[model samples]
Target chain A: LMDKNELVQKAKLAEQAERYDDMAACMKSVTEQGAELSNEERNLLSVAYKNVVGARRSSWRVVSSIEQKTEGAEKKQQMAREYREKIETELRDICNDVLSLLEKFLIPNASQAESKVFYLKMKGDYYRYLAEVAAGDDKKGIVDQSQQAYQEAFEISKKEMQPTHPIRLGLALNFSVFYYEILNSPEKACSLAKTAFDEAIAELDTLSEESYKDSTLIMQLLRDNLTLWTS
Target chain B: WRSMTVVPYL
Candidate 1:
């Protein structure tokens, strides 16, 4: 439903206007039906897509402060470019730590200090990292990663801890803050975070409340930084 | 900022 209707709309809009790249995207969706379209229609859209993608790829590098002969915007741009590189490296290291910790916990005979609970945890961390990189246009993938990790972690922790384990809610908070704030998947992240928080109200008794609050707050600070970097 | 040998763009 989404593909057929939207592709047609996009194709018409792209063709009538001079938007070749957009037309290409729409055409890709309608690849099966391309036999019916004119050669010019197909060629033009293909060229547009090829040109735009090439343009974006070449231009994706950040502004270089050193390369610019003049100061001001170029210098500022260079600074911005370097800043992104720095943040990306830092985020990678953090997710690496996250992966190490998860690996320790994921094994059947798990230890809390270090373990990866699932491959998904590492993937989720990376999704969040990429969300940071995409500059906000990429949200769906990040939110999906957060949800995947949260669900898997919740099930494992439930069995590992006694019935009194309050981890589920707190985890919800941690995952939520990271997804909503850090990953910048506003709608999905907010919804999940609220769901976990709301559940915490009823289920916080399952684990240590203080620990819950502490962990949630800690991740909240981390999430806030993602916002600043990505913003 | 980074300093490097030039890579061919062509």
Candidate 2:
């Protein structure tokens, strides 16, 4: 039987990484095997299990939404909301949960194939959001830190997603905006925006019409946003 | 761009 403390610690770490399945398994093992666990430990296990279930509910809900939207059938808002909340609870606690874990940092033990690149991308997000925030507030007051964040995120994404990924398009747009609006580097922003636009358009063309026909719309939106920065 | 740290309220 695993000790209660060790199991709890593992569960907490897994929670931070959004490894709900592992967290549930760890917690369950504790309640089932830890002979000395208090009433509190049992309660914690229940909560952990519920969160795992909720995350599954939410993930499938997202997939369902994608499928339903692709079919052009608008599902009821309440149905959507219910599943969203269920999944969000798990993700919020495990993935995006930021209450006491104020800082974003690298996770130890990530797969070698994805660990370094993934952590860098996350660090990049810090910069992207920071720059995005700065440019929106006041182009002049925009901080260097924000630019650094977008630049980092952009570079890492370029490296990891190498040769262009669909998700990278919008991020590149954000980078362009950060450059043009905040850094007052119109030339750089223009260059970045064009790249973002071209990549997005290319992907939109290749994406399956039946499976992700929404590409046409998403591409147009990216083009429209690019135009805003160009002129 | 450095000052703003988030997208607009949208």
Interface RMSD, in order shown: 20.6, 11.2
Give the candidate number with the greatest lDDT.
2
The local lDDT score (0 to 100) that residue A140 gets in candidate 1 is 67
Q: Rate the local accuracy (lDDT) of all candidates.
A: 0.46, 0.49
Model 2 Cα lDDT, one tens digit per residue, A87-198: 5444434423311111322233233322333333333443333332232454333355445544655666666653234345545655565566556787777676667667
Cα shift from native, residue A228, model 2 (Å): 1.7
- In Å, candidate 2's interface RMSD is 11.2
A49: Cα error in model 1, Å: 42
Q: lDDT (0-100) at residue A47 of candidate 1? A: 48
- After superposition, the stretches of candidate 2 with alpha carbons farther than 4 Å from their true spots are A1-142, A162-164, A202-218, B1-10
Write candidate 1's Cα lDDT for A41-118 as tens digits: 334433444444434322433322333533566766577667656655555454444344334432223335122232
- Please tell me how candidate 1 rates in CAPRI terms: incorrect
The estimated TM-scores of all candidates read 0.39, 0.39
